[PDB]
Each structure stands twice: as structure tokens, then as C-alpha cells.
Structure 1
Amino acid sequence: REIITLQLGQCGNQIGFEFWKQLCAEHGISPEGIVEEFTDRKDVFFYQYIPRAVLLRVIHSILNSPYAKLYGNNWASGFSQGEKIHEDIFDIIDREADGSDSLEGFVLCHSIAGGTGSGLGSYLLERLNDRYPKKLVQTYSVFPVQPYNSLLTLKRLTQNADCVVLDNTALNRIATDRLHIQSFSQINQLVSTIMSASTTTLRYPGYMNNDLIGLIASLIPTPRLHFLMTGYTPLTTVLDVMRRLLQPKNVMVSNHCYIAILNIIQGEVDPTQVHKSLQRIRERKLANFIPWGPASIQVALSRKSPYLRVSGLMMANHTSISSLFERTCRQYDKLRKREDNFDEMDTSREIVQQLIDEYHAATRPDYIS
């Protein structure tokens, strides 16, 4: 069960290469895509070694790197181009699907703010649901005329992508306080760390979590509540790492309660005291939950790359993420009253109203019906 990855837009093509140079480094893979001598299951991302990537000016910058053998700005303008290269790119996609044994999902890296992303990323999600109906489409989208590109795209991600947001505002903030940078070339270093540890349990043989479905299904209960958040603490026991997760000082975000938590530990900690850590957490009551439905806090273990100490990544499903939408849609209404049909942008505002409504109604004891 392999996952074909697609990368669109400048931001998407940039984070992917930094995600690729990170992944092949964790394994014994030379930049020439050849194994070096120097158990780790490597089939999920690599084909027999070539990564199952489809990259879509910046391409020249990638081929000039020593990793060469590894393989306008308006929403309307980006879409029009899509329909014109409709047939051209799908043969690239289709041939990769038939080549794989049992294709499972579609990882996509794109930015709503990015024009190409706001035009070409939006078009694929409708076509991907049309051609292949039984394939999950999960995207590592990243939030930043600017509000327009954002809200118009959110209209597609709420009905097409069945499943992670990365806000540049919080990322640029974290860069100043604990990294002291002031560029794009520095903040991307931490972005790659998130995507890498996000797919840790899949690349190493474990007991459960052997597919993308094995991670998402516990998080998303309903087709509407399909937005997640990440948190990376190390920038030592099992109880030490969790107390740093729940602090909003490290989560890249700018009543309210979670839905379900997934914890990923990449260290060699003694797995006996993890049940002791959870007990004290329930005693302290550090995070609020939903009363309506049964939910639990989960944790998983794995092994750090030996060829390269405890790290940690958390997957959070919080209703506070709705506020970020409101801020955007608020600015959208601000530009609507100041400036062929101008109707598609009207229905898009209405459908996102349901999403923010669903979350604000989710934090009530009567979210059902």
C-alpha cells in the first residue's frame, strides 16, 4: 500500500525537496538514489530506488542541486491553465497508479496563498474525486487579493480533501524567539521536521499504524470535522515529553476543547511507565475534552533513524482552529464592501459558514443534530 505524492506551487515544490532530502537521509540512500552500505521498511515512499513524486522556474533550481538524479497570481488565472493541461498531466498520474501494487492515498503539498496553488491545486481536488473515488486525498496545506485566494480554496478542501494546516504567522514567530533568524530558506528546516515525523510509524515495522488510514480514522469522526494540527516539542522520560505538548507555546497556532490526540514518540524510552504518565495527566486535567462522544488520548512508539535522545510529535484536533478561518473570512467581507457572474465566490462564503458553525456547535453538549 504505497502513497503517491504530488507537489504544486513554489511553496509546495520547495517543502517537498526539503522533505525528500530529509527522508532519504534517515535511510541509507545516497543523493544518487543508490543504497549505501553503512529492517527499515522503505517501500511506502520509494519504488524499486526512486521516490514516487510528481513535481509541477523552480524546477531548474532542483536539477542544479547534486540531487539531480533523484527523479499569474489570481485564482481565476490558475484554474484556466489547469483545464488546458488537463490531459497532459493525468497520464503522468495514471501511469504511476497502475505501476503501484495497491495505491492507497495521495499526499499533496500546496499553499492557498500561492497563486499557482490557488488555481491548480483547487482544480485537481475536484478531478481527483471524479476519476478515482476510493482514494483518500490528504494535503499538507499551509495558510499565509490574499484573502480571496485563501477562502476560494477552502471551499474545495472542505468537500474534496478527506483530511493538516501550517500557519506561516506562528512559524515566523517561532523563528524569532527560539531560533533568532531576524528567510524562507531557514523556516523550511522546521517544516520538513514535521512532515518527516508525521510519517514515522509507517516507515518502520510496528504493531498497528501500518497505513495512512491507521492514523486518520481515529481523529476524524464526522465528514465535517476534518482539520488537524501538529506540535513538535524538541527544539528524559515519557512524562517529560507530554507536558510540553499540551502547552500552546509550541503548537503552531495563533468553549474550546480537542477531539482526539495522537502522540508519536521517536525515542527508546521504557514503554512500561507510559501508563503512569497518562494517569497523572488525567489527575492534573491539563486539557479539556468533549462530553458527548467517547474519545481517548493515544500514544505510539517508533525508532529514530540509526544512521543519523528523545523527540516528539503530537497530532491535535482542536476547535480553536475555527478562529483562523473567521479571521480570513472577516477580511474577505472587508474587501467585498471596498473592492463574469461573481457568484461562485458567493456560494463559497456560504459553505464555509457551515464549517465554522459545525465546530462552534461541536463544543456544546448537544452537537448531535
Structure 2
Amino acid sequence: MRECISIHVGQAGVQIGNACWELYCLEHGIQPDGQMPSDKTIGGGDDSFNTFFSETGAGKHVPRAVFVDLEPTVIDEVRTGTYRQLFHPEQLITGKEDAANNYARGHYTIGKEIIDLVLDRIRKLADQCTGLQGFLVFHSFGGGTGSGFTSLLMERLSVDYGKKSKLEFSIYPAPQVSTAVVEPYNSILTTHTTLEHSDCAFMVDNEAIYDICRRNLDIERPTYTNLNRLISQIVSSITASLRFDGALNVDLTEFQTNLVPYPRIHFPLATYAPVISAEKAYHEQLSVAEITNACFEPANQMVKCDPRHGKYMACCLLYRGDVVPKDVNAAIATIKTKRSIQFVDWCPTGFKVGINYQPPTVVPGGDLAKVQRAVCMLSNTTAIAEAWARLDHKFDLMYAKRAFVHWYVGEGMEEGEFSEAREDMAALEKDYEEVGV
């Protein structure tokens, strides 16, 4: 099989991870203890979902997942929650002392004390694979562990597994739901040191997921759970092609081929539709054309930016549900015409289309209403450079006065790495500038 190993780093990664794996089990008919009745396989097999789930001799399906955190408070709830006996116990690694929202602690002082244990555990999962193809890393930009340790992990993984691919699911920080003033620092610091080692990174803007919950789901003050369940819906759409027999994005290397023209600008923009509140169970069922057009309304994006102010470089449409291809081609031709969405003059001006005829699954307990057809548009557009512009502005107001820098220098880090990371980020903004016009 072509296995994938999901890694979750920090509080955010872990909690988003637990929601994605909750959803996966339901999409595949796996009980919280791993036992699946409708699978003749009892030792492994070669189904489409074996890429994400191992299989013991007793018929238990164990995720190919590792959870890491420098504190235990979060991973301790995984060890006692509904999915106690789902994950590999040895694949739930924790420390005693966290990185205190500090990139240098998660990457240097504190991260060094646990890095070798996480690699050996990953190596354990890797050695149980017959054709590992890469990793799916889940982490936040803001935390000390999500930024520091994750960066440290992506460096070591490039040295050990050099041929394998690496995909990120990054949580772009938002002030409505934040936890530290130094998150701009940690964001710029990890992006610079990770941009070299990642093949494709899907940023999730907590402010965008926050807005969607308040207007499309009618939730006054959303919680991390509302966000995560909604995030897990988008992630599942991206990883579905890897878990079900499909024609579009069948393996990790194809994500790069279809979405990442140039290595450095590997940040595609995700858009998902429809998002309807569960309190509206008898809503009119939207058609392919209505949800295909919804993928271009900026109010449905996972990162806040204006794609109308940027050229497209790639665009993949991932439909899920009762979707007839003839209606998809028609809806694409409607978009290619009435819409003034400009593609770069050097890439194909077409849309790739995958269709998964399974109806979208909603977690029993969430706020999302069951729909019969939904779509997730992955698109690499230069308009996402605005997200780098907002972060770069914060990492500038503070660094101009060298605010909070002493906390990083005192944790085994050179002051020069701030100017390095920022110059590298500046270099990234020009890459998007030259690709556009």
C-alpha cells in the first residue's frame, strides 16, 4: 500500500488531529476501538483507506498517526477520551515542560530533549509500511511547540526520509482567538526554517474559520471545538483522494504536481462549500452550479485575501456527493466565462476535477447540517501573499524595537535569525509579486 503518516505537533495540531481522525473513522465505518464489521480483511489488505490505517491481527484498525506535545495536558485527554483505544499508545508522546509560546524553546532548549524519541516512534510506524510516500504535519504557527518543535521535526525528516513528501496543515494566527503577543515572531521564524523542507502547505486562518462559524453556523462566541470540527471538514476533503480510490490527487507527489508550480510558493488557498447550520435540517439542497460558484465568494475561504486581486496558478475542484460530471463541466464553463478570474500566462488555464460519490459525513454532535453534495476548491493564487503581508507587518512593529527578542536569544538562538527569517519572508513576497502583474 501507499501509506501516509499523520503527525500532530502542539495543542492545535493535536486537537485538529483528534477531530480529523474522529471524522475519518466515520467516513470509513471504523468504531472508536478500531473494529470495522464490513471489511473481510483481518490483517491488512490493500483497500483505499489502508493508507491511513494500519491493521493488527485481531482486525483492529490503528491510525498511522503520531501525536506530539511538550506538555501532557492536551494529549492526556486523548488518552482518556472517546478514542482511548484507537491510536497507538506509544504514538502519543508528551513532555513535562512546554515552550511557553517561545519558538526558541520548542526548537532548541526544550525541543532537543524529545526530538529523538519522536523520530524513533515515527521510524516505528515507517518500518511497518511497504511504500511510505510522505507525512501530513498538523501544527499552529503561533505556539512554541507548533512553530519551534515542528520546524525542528521537518529538518530531521528531510535528512532521514529524503525521498518522501511532506505536507503541512498550518494554523495561521488570529487575534480574535489568540494566546500570545509573540505569535508573529514564531510564525515568521517557523515559515522561514520550514519553507525549505515542505512540499505543500495548506494555511488555515483562524479568523476565517471564526467568521464562518459566526455567520454560517450562528455561533456567538465560537470555541476551539467549533473551529476544529469545521477545519476537519476541509482537511477531510483534501485527504479524501488519498483515502478513497480516486483520479485526482491520488498520492502526495501529485499535490505538488497539480497545486505547487514553484517550490517556494507552495501555499494553496482552500475554499469549501456549503456550510449550513445543523439547526436548518430541512434546507433547500444546493446544486453543483450554486456550490461551484460559492468557491469564489471570498466569504468561504480558509485564508482571508482577495483572489480577484491575484492571478491563479492552479485550481483543483474536489466534489463530494451526488454530483454528475456533466453538471460539473457546465458549472466550470459558467465560471470560466462570466467570471474575470485571471490565470498566469504560463500555466494551463483549466480546472482539474475529482469526484468522490460519497455523501459528506457530519460528526454526530457537531453544528454542520448533512448535505448531499459539497466541494472543496484548492487553488494556488498570488492573492495569498496578503496573508504574509499581515504577519510581516506585525513582525516589524515589534522587531523594530527588538521587543521580546531577549526571550528568544536566552533560549539558545542568535539575533541574526530574526533578520534572516524576515529577509526570507520579504523574498517570498517578491516571488508572488513577479508571478503576478
State the partner residue of 2:8: 7
CA drift at 1:208: 4.8
**1:75 aligned onto 2:103:** yes
**1:335 aligned onto 2:335:** no
Alignment of 1:128-143 (within 5 A): 128-143=157-172
**CA distance change for structure 1 residues 33 and 305 in 2, over 3 Å: closer, same or farther?**
farther
**CA distance change for structure 1 residues 259 and 36 in 2, over 3 Å: closer, same or farther?**
same
| Whole-Å separation in 1 of the counterparts to 2:249 and 2:260 | 15
CA drift at 1:37: 4.4
* Contact 2:103/2:143 (8 A) holds in 1: no
Per-residue CA deviations over 1:157-214 (Å, capped at 9, x if unaligned) read 3211111000011111112112222211222110110111112222222345321223
**CA distance change for structure 1 residues 305 and 150 in 2, over 3 Å: closer, same or farther?**
same
**What SS does structure 2 have at the residue aligned with 1:107?**
strand
| Whole-Å separation in 1 of the counterparts to 2:294 and 2:345 | 25
**Aligned sequence identity (%):** 34
* Contact 2:268/2:381 (8 A) holds in 1: yes
Which of 45, 48, 51 aligns to 1:41? It is 48
TM-score normalised by length of structure 1: 0.93
* Counterpart residue identity of residue 149, structure 1: N
Alignment of 1:90-109 (within 5 A): 90-109=119-138
Greater shift after overlay, 188-197 or 85-94? 85-94
State the partner residue of 2:26: 25
**What SS does structure 1 have at the residue aligned with 2:270?**
strand
* Counterpart residue identity of residue 245, structure 2: P
**CA distance change for structure 1 residues 331 and 266 in 2, over 3 Å: closer, same or farther?**
same
CA drift at 1:135: 1.1
State the partner residue of 1:172: 210
Per-residue CA deviations over 1:111-140 (Å, capped at 9, x if unaligned) read 010121122111011111112211111110
Per-residue CA deviations over 1:259-305 (Å, capped at 9, x if unaligned) read 11100111222223433333222221341211233342111111215
Which of 427, 431, 434 aligns to 1:354? It is 427
| Whole-Å separation in 2 of the counterparts to 1:268 and 1:82 | 47
| Whole-Å separation in 2 of the counterparts to 1:38 and 1:139 | 31
State the partner residue of 1:310: 373
Per-residue CA deviations over 1:291-327 (Å, capped at 9, x if unaligned) read 2333421111112159981111110111111111111
State the partner residue of 1:200: 240
State the partner residue of 2:316: 262
State the partner residue of 1:323: 386
**What SS does structure 1 have at the residue aligned with 2:335?**
helix
**What SS does structure 1 have at the residue aligned with 2:166?**
strand
* Contact 1:239/1:274 (8 A) holds in 2: yes
* Counterpart residue identity of residue 312, structure 1: V
* Counterpart residue identity of residue 54, structure 1: V
Which of 142, 146, 156 aligns to 2:193? It is 156
**1:65 aligned onto 2:81:** yes
Residue correspondences, number: 364
* Contact 1:15/1:188 (8 A) holds in 2: yes
**1:212 aligned onto 2:267:** no
**1:271 aligned onto 2:271:** no
* Counterpart residue identity of residue 34, structure 1: Q
| Whole-Å separation in 1 of the counterparts to 2:147 and 2:323 | 43
| Whole-Å separation in 1 of the counterparts to 2:112 and 2:189 | 17
| Whole-Å separation in 2 of the counterparts to 1:165 and 1:270 | 30
Per-residue CA deviations over 1:199-247 (Å, capped at 9, x if unaligned) read 2222222345321223331111111221111111111543232111111
Q: Please, which runs of 5 or more residues in structure 2 have no aligned partner?
A: 41-46, 56-60, 88-99, 174-181, 276-285, 363-371, 404-408
Superposition RMSD in Å: 2.0
| Whole-Å separation in 1 of the counterparts to 2:425 and 2:7 | 26
TM-score normalised by length of structure 2: 0.79
* Contact 1:38/1:307 (8 A) holds in 2: no
Q: Please, which runs of 5 or more residues in structure 1 have no aligned partner?
A: 365-369
**What SS does structure 2 have at the residue aligned with 1:142?**
strand
Greater shift after overlay, 14-23 or 228-237? 228-237
| Whole-Å separation in 1 of the counterparts to 2:224 and 2:361 | 28
**What SS does structure 2 have at the residue aligned with 1:31?**
coil
**1:241 aligned onto 2:241:** no
State the partner residue of 1:367: none
* Contact 1:78/1:116 (8 A) holds in 2: yes
* Contact 1:143/1:167 (8 A) holds in 2: yes
Runs of 4+ in 1 over 4 A off after TM superposition: 37-40, 305-308
**1:121 aligned onto 2:150:** yes
| Whole-Å separation in 2 of the counterparts to 1:306 and 1:194 | 11
**What SS does structure 2 have at the residue aligned with 1:97?**
helix
**What SS does structure 1 have at the residue aligned with 2:18?**
helix
* Contact 2:9/2:145 (8 A) holds in 1: yes
Which of 327, 336, 342 aligns to 1:282? It is 336
* Contact 2:102/2:144 (8 A) holds in 1: yes
* Contact 1:234/1:311 (8 A) holds in 2: yes
Which of 88, 92, 101 aligns to 2:117? It is 88
* Counterpart residue identity of residue 377, structure 2: M
State the partner residue of 1:344: 417
Which of 138, 141, 146 aligns to 1:112? It is 141
